[PDB]
Curated annotation (Swiss-Prot), chain B:
Modified residues (Phosphothreonine): 99, 103
Subunit structure: Interacts with MYO7A; this mediates light-dependent intracellular transport of RPE65.
Origin species: Bos taurus (Bovine)
Entry comment on modification after translation: Palmitoylation by LRAT regulates ligand binding specificity; the palmitoylated form (membrane form) specifically binds all-trans-retinyl-palmitate, while the soluble unpalmitoylated form binds all-trans-retinol (vitamin A).
UniProt keyword annotation of Lipoprotein present: yes
UniProt-listed PANTHER family: BETA-CAROTENE DIOXYGENASE, RETINOID ISOMEROHYDROLASE
GO BP terms in the entry: detection of light stimulus involved in visual perception; retina homeostasis; retinal metabolic process; zeaxanthin biosynthetic process
Keywords: Acetylation, Cell membrane, Cytoplasm, Endoplasmic reticulum, Hydrolase, Iron, Isomerase, Lipid metabolism, Lipoprotein, Membrane, Metal-binding, Microsome, Palmitate, Phosphoprotein, Sensory transduction, Vision
Positions contributing to Fe cation binding: 163, 220, 283, 497
Top-level lineage group: Eukaryota
Protein name: Retinoid isomerohydrolase
GO cellular component: endoplasmic reticulum membrane; membrane; nucleus; plasma membrane
Catalytic activity: an all-trans-retinyl ester + H2O = 11-cis-retinol + a fatty acid + H(+); lutein = (3R,3'S)-zeaxanthin; all-trans-retinyl hexadecanoate + H2O = 11-cis-retinol + hexadecanoate + H(+)
Length: 505, 503
């Protein structure tokens, strides 16, 4: 049955907070596992207005870096605003100086935002907060101090890069970005070598994907990586470069193209000219990708339709009362977890037939006479305006490999209100939910000696603004069944966070 | 997870049998419900060769009419071959005389009247049918053949489906290919006071347009609500330009699926251009109206390749490892809910029109005014079809509903019975090793309060070394728990469709 939020506590996700001067001690209930040693680092908006000047969109608020430290069953919480050009110049001029995703600021040229509110990832011995532009911000993972701004355009030919780089076990970083005919470039950052030189200075383009439209690249949020293949999903959400204006103003939907799926040989650094085609959807998050007998298994968090989902994420709409939030989502794209199966071996003799001969899937791939391969998905999870989103897996051991388990944030008409575990083989689900509690993306941490895939915990940051309650807490669930293991309660609000990582120490 | 059939018992589904001179008494295990009074009538192929001349396709064998009679907890079984032109002329000339679906006869166009697919009521009469212009009046008590009827003598259609909709007053609706190419809805009225044959009062009430001027789509079934008719135009096309029927089918690679609605009461086609990805469709499950949306529940096969290509007898008779290998590149079966908006507002161009709270089905209004549909998937198993769907038809046909019953096909071999809650997607299964059931037919308890207060009846082939070769299975519709069997000592070949006639 439909869970309701009439009290409107979710509004606290989108309320400005102050940074701390030093870490707070969190009040622990239950038992923090003694093997859990390290830092949960997470990025989100923390400042939603500069004086009387408002930010309009969910992706506009000034980057706030959060840290929960775990040591011997005790927890501290710390947060600092990232000292980006956007933040520093805003504090200096006491106004909005840099144009954000959905907020225009009112020549050196186009001043692109470095507001790194989306994610943080490792490069060599360093950590970088990012958005989706050419600017990433080196940060100190212990003090949360801002170290420097890095312009990727100083190193490689891309106009931007996603907040979802793939990290191989040796520390190699892969990312994708729009580039110049328009194309999409895969960037490779090598591991830190003996010479100890900055790995970003050894950045290179390893392969290029073509674009469906000569002058209009698709919005790309994430991509798939296996040992042998790179998967790129080209969606009908297009950037109109032929466009006072913010970033949102430049987006349009291509009604006729549907979705084009692209594979590249990772090791031979070659685009493969297989024309994979399917019906229109928005895609933000790949769940996982893997190889199975010369098929690519592509697990996706989809939104059914070509209308840009970001149209529904203005702060004015997310701050409305619950009945209005539900009404606003009535005509939105429907979320759905889909498994696509891409055949690598295309035989002309099988023209007109289903090429997906795997025994354990209902996904199909029809070879047409024009050599397009029409894909139908296997649906893994589908709930009415109930999204399985911000997906996480046991990434270190099962990223790019055959796997069973995904963890997700459950969005109820775009409001995060539960944590989900999905068995992608059986479609069995587990749920954690508490009334008037709004969790964040769940991050999986393995028991260090685990042989099983789901032997560990998930960490989520939860906002719980009740009359007589602690306003926020770090939630620790058993990854086996999402049963509660512990909470670390703080006496201050925590706004929405998007992505992060657990840094073991 | 995968159920295996190495013993190859399913071959008995496709083995010739002899008709009976009179009904056999069946051996009852468990308890036949005492409220169950009437006849289970079912049609299928019974003769798969005429001497040394073989039939090649599943839909070629000569029509056999089956009857299980229920009275006071006792059961009889009777079967008679239908005396069609195809059967009579075959017995006369001791060879294949009439061309069947997938078997050419060697010496104008003599169209098959081999009524092996279904039986349905018209007025006080019962008709066995295939999908041609010829239906066969049969005696539901004796299983005697009464008359051949040519629908072309009454209405402008080239054929009609084996899946007419029957309203509670006895009104029959059907669809068929016709000229100016189009698809015609035929209406046969109830028997009136004047007592004249209702078929002589047959009329075309509405016409659906065709996607291709010269190539009609194959149509197996259609949807009916109190106010609407739903027709699904698939990419399986009949190319009118020693051939059999199978030879004339081709797949249109680019059109996908076109969905069509007509106003039933105003007898008008509605020019809403519903479009989706390619699939084969044989069986509509149910259709209903929900706040100016049509809910369209379908048994789909993902792809444009004709599923009938996989149903030649030579392939269905192969050993189990070969049956599985043959199905590897076949379309994948999937139960899908489509939601068709009736109210299209131009102001919502580019958006999802499906505002219903209880579905993930979408309908995107495009600038060219096409409405692109995405389904809600209700059931999906690898080469495991929920097929031959049945509901509590009398009370829930065309209406909001919760429960469907189905035959489970394992790489096209029927090997289980299924119940689906279309709201929660919960399933129930009945399955026994070396047991191959038929379409389940629902019969309501006379004092039923709920939708699933009753039983389903299925005919099961079980040719194990030391077992009765076939039986009538009765399951409780609540949980598909076994209630009774009526065992016979003779084989029963595959049956497609039928009905329970209450007495
Ligand atoms: N988190 C979703 C969007 C957010 O990260 C964001 C914020 C600001 C700008 C932005 O731009 C997206 C992209 C548009 C195309 C581009 F090439 F200019 C590179 C940047 C994206
Ligand atoms: N249900 C399996 C198909 C079977 O009933 C069958 C047997 C023989 C002929 C046949 O024809 C289908 C179709 C062919 C074209 C048509 F226009 F005559 C309309 C009917 C169909
Ligand atoms: C935790 C966020 C809750 C608020 C609403 C979220 C709506 C999610 C829509 C799909 C994914 C959006 C992109 C993920 C965030 C990012 O990486 O920038
Ligand atoms: C009881 C049948 C078992 C043998 C193989 C069945 C394969 C069915 C494929 C999908 C449905 C085909 C059309 C239904 C039959 C009919 O109405 O003529
Ligand atoms: Fe993201
Ligand atoms: Fe049928």
């Amino acid at each position: 049955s439909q869970v309701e939020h009439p009290a409107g506590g979710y509004k606290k996700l989108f309320e400005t907070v102050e940074e701390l001067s030093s870490p707070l001690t969190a009040h622990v209930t239950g038992r923090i596992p003694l093997w859990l040693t390290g830092s949960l680092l997470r990025c989100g908006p923390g400042l939603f207005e500069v004086g009387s000047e408002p930010f309009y969109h969910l992706f506009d608020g000034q980057a706030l870096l959060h840290k929960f430290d775990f040591k011997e069953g005790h927890v501290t919480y710390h947060r600092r605003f990232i000292r980006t050009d956007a933040y520093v110049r805003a504090m200096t001029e006491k106004r909005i100086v840099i144009t954000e995703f959905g907020t225009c600021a009112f020549f050196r040229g186009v001043e692109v935002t470095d507001n790194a509110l989306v994610n943080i990832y490792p490069v060599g011995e360093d950590y970088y907060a990012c958005t989706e532009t050419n600017f990433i911000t080196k940060v100190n993972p212990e003090t949360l101090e801002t170290i420097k701004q890095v312009d990727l355009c100083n190193y490689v030919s891309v106009n931007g890069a996603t907040a979802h780089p793939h990290i191989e076990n040796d520390g190699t970083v892969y990312n994708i970005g729009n580039c110049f005919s328009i194309a999409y470039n895969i960037v490779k950052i090598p591991p830190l070598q003996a010479d100890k030189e900055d790995p970003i200075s050894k950045s290179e383009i390893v392969v290029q994907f073509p674009c469906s439209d000569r002058f209009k690249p698709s919005y790309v949020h994430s991509f798939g990586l296996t040992p042998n293949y790179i998967v790129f999903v080209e969606t009908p959400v297009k950037i109109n470069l032929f466009k006072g204006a913010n970033y949102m103003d430049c987006f349009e939907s291509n009604e006729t193209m549907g979705v084009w799926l692209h594979i590249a040989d990772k090791k031979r650094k070659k685009y493969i000219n297989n024309k994979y085609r399917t019906s229109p959807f928005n895609l933000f998050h790949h769940i996982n990708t893997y190889e199975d007998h010369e098929f690519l298994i592509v697990d996706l968090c989809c939104w059914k339709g070509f209308e840009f989902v970001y149209n529904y994420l203005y702060l004015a709409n997310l701050r409305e009362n619950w009945e209005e939030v539900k009404k606003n989502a009535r005509k939105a794209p429907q979320p759905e977890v889909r498994r696509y199966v891409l055949p690598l071996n295309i035989d002309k003799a099988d023209t007109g037939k289903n090429l997906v001969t795997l025994p354990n899937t209902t996904a199909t791939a029809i070879l047409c006479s024009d050599e397009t391969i029409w894909l139908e998905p296997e649906v893994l999870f589908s709930g009415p305006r109930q999204a399985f989103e911000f997906p996480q897996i046991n990434y270190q051991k099962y990223g790019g490999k055959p796997y069973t388990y995904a963890y997700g944030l459950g969005l109820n008409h775009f409001v995060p209100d539960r944590l989900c575990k999905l068995n992608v083989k059986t479609k069995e689900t587990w749920v954690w939910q508490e009334p008037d509690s709004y969790p964040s993306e769940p991050i999986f941490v393995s028991h260090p000696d685990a042989l099983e895939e789901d032997d560990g915990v998930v960490l989520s940051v939860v906002v719980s603004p009740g009359a007589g309650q602690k306003p926020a807490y770090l939630l620790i669930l058993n990854a086996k069944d999402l049963s509660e293991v512990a909470r670390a309660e703080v006496e201050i609000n925590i706004p929405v966070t998007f992505h992060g990582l657990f840094k073991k120490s």
